[PDB]
Structure formats: C-alpha cells, structure tokens
Amino acid sequence: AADLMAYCEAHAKEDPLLTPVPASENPFR
Amino acid sequence: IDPVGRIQMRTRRTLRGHLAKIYAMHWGTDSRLLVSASQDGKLIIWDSYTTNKVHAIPLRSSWVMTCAYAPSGNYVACGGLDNICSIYNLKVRVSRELAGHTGYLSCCRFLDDNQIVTSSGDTTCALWDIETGQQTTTFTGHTGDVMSLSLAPDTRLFVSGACDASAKLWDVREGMCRQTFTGHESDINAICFFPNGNAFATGSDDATCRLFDLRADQELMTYSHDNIICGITSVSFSKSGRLLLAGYDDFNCNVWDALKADRAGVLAGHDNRVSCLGVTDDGMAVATGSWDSFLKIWN
Amino acid sequence: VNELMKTLQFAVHIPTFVLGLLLNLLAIHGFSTFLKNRWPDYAATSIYMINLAVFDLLLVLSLPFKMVLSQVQSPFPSLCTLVECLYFVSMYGSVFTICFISMDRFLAIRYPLLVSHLRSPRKIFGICCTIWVLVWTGSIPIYSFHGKVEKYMCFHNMSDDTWSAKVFFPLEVFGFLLPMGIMGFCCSRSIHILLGRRDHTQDWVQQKACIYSIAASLAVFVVSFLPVHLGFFLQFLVRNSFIVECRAKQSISFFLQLSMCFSNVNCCLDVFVYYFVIKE
Amino acid sequence: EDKAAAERSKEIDKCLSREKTYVKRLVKILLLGADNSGKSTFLKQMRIIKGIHEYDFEIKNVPFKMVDVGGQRSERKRWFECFDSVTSILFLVDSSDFNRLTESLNDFETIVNNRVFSNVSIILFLNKTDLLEEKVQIVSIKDYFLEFEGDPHCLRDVQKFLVECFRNKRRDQQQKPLYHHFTTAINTENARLIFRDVKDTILHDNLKQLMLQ
Ligand SMILES: Cc1c(C(=O)NN2CCCCC2)nn(-c2ccc(Cl)cc2Cl)c1-c1ccc(I)cc1
C-alpha cells in the first residue's frame, strides 16, 4: 500500500511510459 | 495521490512476417532483442529497434502457446500442445527437447542458464534442470490448468494462475506453495509481479483485473469498468508502478493506472484479439502482438 | 405521337433520374463503408459493386440532359457529344460490369478451389479498370456523328456514318450478344451447379436464395437489354432501306425511344436486384 | 554496420514468403471420435504417412493436414481449442455400438456448439456399416432410442435416423454445412469423399465471399 506509493514516487524518473522522453534518450523515436 | 490522467502512448514500429496469430512474446533483459512465436509453428527473434528478423526458428509442433527468452539472452524456450518444452540454443538448433509434462504447456520462464519453471495443462508447475534432462521439483495444489506463470524479480519465488479464479505463490527453494489468493470468477489468463517483488497483478476472463500483495496477503484492490466485457489476455508493468497494462479480446490494449484505479490510455492499431504484451526491462517501450500476426512497439 | 413521345420520355426519366441518383449514391456509400474498413471477404466484390454503381450513377447524370436538352435547340455540338458519349459509356459499362460479375459467379461456383486463391481484390480492380478502358475506347466512334447540322436537338439526327455494317455488327454481337451469351451460360451453369448440391449437404436448403438472386439477375439483364437492341436492329434496317412504310417506321422509332427510356431504368433495377440481396 | 544485417532479414523473408503459398493453400481437418470409433484402421486405410498427432497427405495436388487429437479432446476450456482456423472437423463414430451412440452424440453436441467452431464445417463418418448392416436385424435400433419412427429391421430407416440424430444436435443450423457418410472399415476410396466435402466447404466459403445472398 504505502510502500507501493513510495516505490512509485522514488522510481518515477526511470519510466519512459509515465514520462515519455524526447528523441535525445528515446531509441524508438 | 497525484493522478497521471492520460498518456499519449504512440506506436514506434511494426513487425511483419508471421503467418498466423501471435500467441506470446518476451522482452529480453537488454530490451533490444524480442522473441515471439505464432500458431503457425514459427518462433522469431526480432531486432526491436530496427525491425530486423534476427532469427526465424521453425517448430515441430505448430500448436504452441508459450515462449521464453533467457535473462542471459543465451537460450529461448518454446512450449505448446505437444507437451514437450524445447530449449533452443541461439548459438539455432534444439538444445534440449526437454520433456516430462502431460498437459499442454502454457508458460515457461527461465531462472538462469540452467533452470526453467513450466506451467502446463497437468495442473502442476514443474521446475526443470536442462542439464540433468528431468525435473528438479514439482509444485502441486491447484485444480484447474495452470495457464499463467510469473517469476519474482529476485529468482526466489513465483506465482501461478490456474483457471480456478485463484493464484498460488510458491517458493522455488522450498518446492512448495507459500500462499493462495482468490477474488475472480473465471480462468487466470495471465499474471505478473509488481517489479519491486512484493505485489502482483492478475487478469481473468471475467473482464476484471486485480492487484494483490504477498505482504498483507489480501486482495489490495481491483480494476473494472462496466463498458469492458472481454477477457484480459495478458498483463505487464511499468517500473514506476503508477501504471499497469492489459491486453484484451476487444481488439485493443488498455493501459490503466495502477494506483488511482482508472483507465489512463488505450492502444489501438490491432486488427484482431490482443494475445501478447510486454514491457522492456528498462521500461522504454511496450510491445504487443495480436491475432493479426502484427507485433507493434508502443512507447 | 410527338406529344406522347415527350410526355412518356419525361414521365419515365424524372422518377428514373431521381431514383437512380439516390439509390446509386446510397450503394456507393454502403460499399465504400464495407470496402474501406479493410474487410477482406467483402472487398473483391465491393470493388465491382462500386464500379457498377458508378456506371449507373453516370447514366443517371445524362438523364436531365435528355429531359431538358432533348428537343431544345442548343448551339453546343461539344456538349451534345459529351452527353451522348456519357450515355453510351454508362449504359454499356453497366452491361459489361454485369457480364463480368456473372462470369465471376460462375467461375467461383464451378471452380471453387481456384477462385479461392486467385481472388485478389487488386485483380478485381484490374478487371474494373479494363472495363472502363474498353468502354471509353469503344466510345470513340460516337465522335463521328456530326453529319451536317450545327443547331442540335440532342439524341436525334444521328449520322449514317455510324449506321453502316462496320459500326452496327460489332455493336450488336460485342455489346449485347456476347454479354447475353456469357451472362446466359454463366447464370445457367451456376444455377445447375448450385442445384446439383442435393447429392450432399443441407446447402440444398441453405444456398437457395443464391439461385433466386442469380435467376432474378439474369431476368433483369435480359429484359432490360433484349428488346432495346432488337429495336436498335429495327432502326438499322430502317436506315438500310429495308423498311419503307412511313407509319410503321414512325411506330418503330417510338418503340426504340421508349425501349431506351425503359432500358435506362436498369440503373434502378441493378440497384434492387443487387444491393438489396445483401445483408444491409 | 547494423543495417547490413537487414540483408539477412531479407533472406529470411525469402523463405517465409514461400510459406505464404502453402499456409494459404493448406486445408486443416480435425479428426475426432472415441476409442471404439476405429481411427487407426481409418488412417491405415488411406496410406497416410507427446500429445496431439498430425498427418500430412495430398489429394489432387491439394495439401491436407489431419490433426489427430489423440485423446486430448476431453478438455473443456477455450484456450486449448486453438483450432478455429481448422477447415473441417471429421468425426468417426462406431455406428454399431448403440450403447455408445448416446455418448458419441453428446460429443457431437458439445463439439459443434463451440462458438470457436462457428465457422467450421463438419464431416461426420459412421464407421463399420457392415457391423450395422448385419446387426440391425439382430438388434433393434428402437430398443435403444425411444423416438425411432421407421422400421427397426430396415437398414436405411435406421441409417437416416442416425443421420438425423447427429444433424439434430446443432444449434444455429444455418452456419456451415454438415456432410456425412456411411463408410465401412475398409474405406477404399474415402479420400475422394473427404476431398469432395472439403471442396464443397470451399464453395460455400466462396458464396460467402461473393455475397450472393
Ligand atoms: C432515337 C435515337 C436514334 C436514331 O436512330 N434516330 N433516328 C430516328 C430515325 C431517323 C432519324 C433519327 N439513335 N439514338 C441513340 C442515342 C444514344 C446512343 Cl449511346 C445510341 C443511340 Cl443509337 C436514339 C435515342 C434517343 C433517346 C434515347 I433516352 C435513347 C436513344
């Protein structure tokens, strides 16, 4: 529950789906 | 919490060559190489970035329902209605026509270069040693056919779904089942762990997704809308954990919020039922396969 | 008879024109909806259904240019030539589309295996394109109808340069007698082959509406295209000094005028016998 | 560089494109029944060639693939019926054993009502008619079925009764054809019959593509 929310908060930075990246760091673009 | 609302989730590639329905795919650990096979008896390893057929492996059994790609990228696994799990050495000939099951195979996922966990129609999940040639342990306790299997992201435990609206968390080391979970109405079509390893999500033909944990050992929450009626063919996850995915029979892949309990996106672009769905090990981009024979790589 | 001429032609054309326009536009709509949705079973058939509907819509278009420009004097040889070429093209395009559809059905039924592989919608599109090409290529001799008049009452005073043997004989055999022969052989064999399937399954009570629709299609094609071309033959004989009677020739001319205004409504009869024996 | 490997990819397609002219010309035929039906004598009668078995043969340059479910048929959930692409379901039934005919009919009724097989034709076979032609007189067909109307000593009355019993099991009769036949255990030219019924199934498919109705 709360642990899942903390994991979401801490690891959101490496989520190319939650935060799509421009072609700078996007091999699929 | 802070909702993510909607995600503009766009395709980035489309992969062609399969002559029938795709039944399953697998994302490698390097995210670059993908493996998927069809029900025409063909495995193909794809270059996911460049859309290049790295390998096209024929099969003896054209009735094939699971595929695997080793975490070391060395081997692949292939199981189907002929009950024999073929381990293929990419470096492609059969490494081991490794047998021992009675029912048709439904899900096989390597633990290392040597151990493989298989689910079948025999209702028992069997952990096999390729070098020995025979099983090294067998988990029982289910009633229906174990169609779904998902490994923990520590190579220590695993989950199995078995057509009886229930899932078994079992321990690889202890060779026995550790916990059981209920909450559905129909078959467990696919199951996957939360990438941290203390929770998992289930999809069932009752058009309802669910999310449980091994910590509280209870049904944490559920996902369902009245306008959705098709069965969840496959699920996956994103590293953050604010999202989960669900392939559907209703021609589309619905991507839902894993916490806020609402739909956050829909991937169309499939001409048939969605059968395969995976997320790369670095979280870059989703891939889905459908009965079109068309794998496409969303992002 | 001339007042009767105009009254009959107008009272036939106006409902024919409106009905043909509406029905053929609706047919194009429906089969476009079927085709663009990437439907693979209903593609290689919607292609020639669209081609038929388009030829029929074009023949609908040339109707008011006979309902307001028939006897009205008009210093426009180019417009009258365009209208007459449109009329010939659309009518004989409907003719040849029907003939090709019937060959399609007999080839699918007599040979069920082959047409199941050699069934490219692109192949049907190639056949339709060849249909348009041949129709418009054959519609070149309609240019040589000028004669010696400038003020034209359209659909009249058609020149004897296009009444000789070399323009009539390759127009009856290759415009009616060959479509009649092909439509007859294909439709009869398709009926006799869907009938021979009583030696086996329930298709003897399942693929029965197909026989009714194929028979209806043969009947409509023949009854819209048998009398008018024999009237065409009668007028050719009038043009070859074979019939000299004045009252009889006037009656024959009225018969040909009425036969063509009855043959055009095939553009409304090809939209009922087809496009209503379908699901929608 | 990397793109040079795409040449190999093209080479791979130069093989897969070959399968394009086969997996489309290929006819799939399930082969079902029970133990007593006599599947083995059937297959051995035409000189044809773990879990499910497969056989490959050719009739008049057409490739047929008989997918013999070797006793795995008893499964009753969707995922195992990965056979919806199969052209036809060929049944065998031991006509003689009237006791087993109820179970055979129950198999028929629970196989044809698979919505998976809503677009599949059936080729039912009633095997061993000699052991029925020489047993209909001795054993009364009406002694087992309470709705038989014809003459229990007449062979053809019983034959038509059985056919109608099997054809009466289909809900939604209007979906696809149902052939049948009364062939003995010899099955001397049975491949011709299979070919004829497959050809008629393809004819029905054509009429479905021609949209004549
Ligand atoms: C009338 C008539 C004639 C004709 O022969 N007229 N002569 C009558 C007696 C001697 C002097 C004039 N030709 N067409 C005709 C027209 C279009 C094509 Cl595509 C082909 C043809 Cl043959 C029509 C005719 C007129 C109106 C209709 I509505 C249909 C046919």
Side-chain angles (χ1 to χ4, degrees), chain B residues 135-152:
Chain B
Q135 320 208 347
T136 49
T137 185
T138 305
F139 318 81
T140 70
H142 270 306
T143 78
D145 285 3
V146 289
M147 292 180 183
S148 70
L149 159 66
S150 172
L151 281 163

Side-chain angles (χ1 to χ4, degrees), chain B residues 19 21 42 53 63 82-83, chain D residues 12-13 19 52 54 84:
Chain B
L19 292 147
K21 313 173 276 179
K42 280 297 195 296
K53 296 180 174 64
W63 317 107
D82 284 333
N83 310 325
Chain D
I12 285 172
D13 291 331
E19 271 166 40
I52 279 188
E54 302 176 334
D84 65 57

Side-chain angles (χ1 to χ4, degrees), chain B residues 16-21 39-40 42 44 50-56 61-65 81-84 102-104 145 147 163 187 205 273 291, chain D residues 2 5-7 9 12-13 16-17 19-21 23 28 51-54 65 67 72 75 78 80-86:
Chain B
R16 296 170 132 81
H18 272 148
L19 292 147
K21 313 173 276 179
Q39 298 174 16
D40 86 327
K42 280 297 195 296
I44 296 169
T50 69
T51 316
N52 296 146
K53 296 180 174 64
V54 181
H55 264 303
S61 82
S62 309
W63 317 107
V64 59
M65 286 175 48
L81 288 192
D82 284 333
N83 310 325
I84 68 184
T102 55
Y104 64 106
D145 285 3
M147 292 180 183
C163 292
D187 310 340
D205 275 352
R273 177 170 143 169
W291 293 5
Chain D
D2 282 344
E7 179 65 26
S9 170
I12 285 172
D13 291 331
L16 259 55
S17 63
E19 271 166 40
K20 267 156 206 61
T21 200
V23 67
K28 264 183 197 55
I52 279 188
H53 269 248
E54 302 176 334
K65 187 171 174 60
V67 186
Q72 275 199 322
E75 193 279 339
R78 163 56 202 101
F80 168 79
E81 321 285 1
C82 46
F83 294 90
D84 65 57
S85 66
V86 167

Side-chain angles (χ1 to χ4, degrees), chain C residues 107-108 111-119, chain D residues 202 206:
Chain C
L107 277 195
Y111 300 91
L113 294 165
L114 299 179
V115 81
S116 297
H117 316 98
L118 286 64
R119 191 44 185 209
Chain D
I202 303 166
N206 295 347

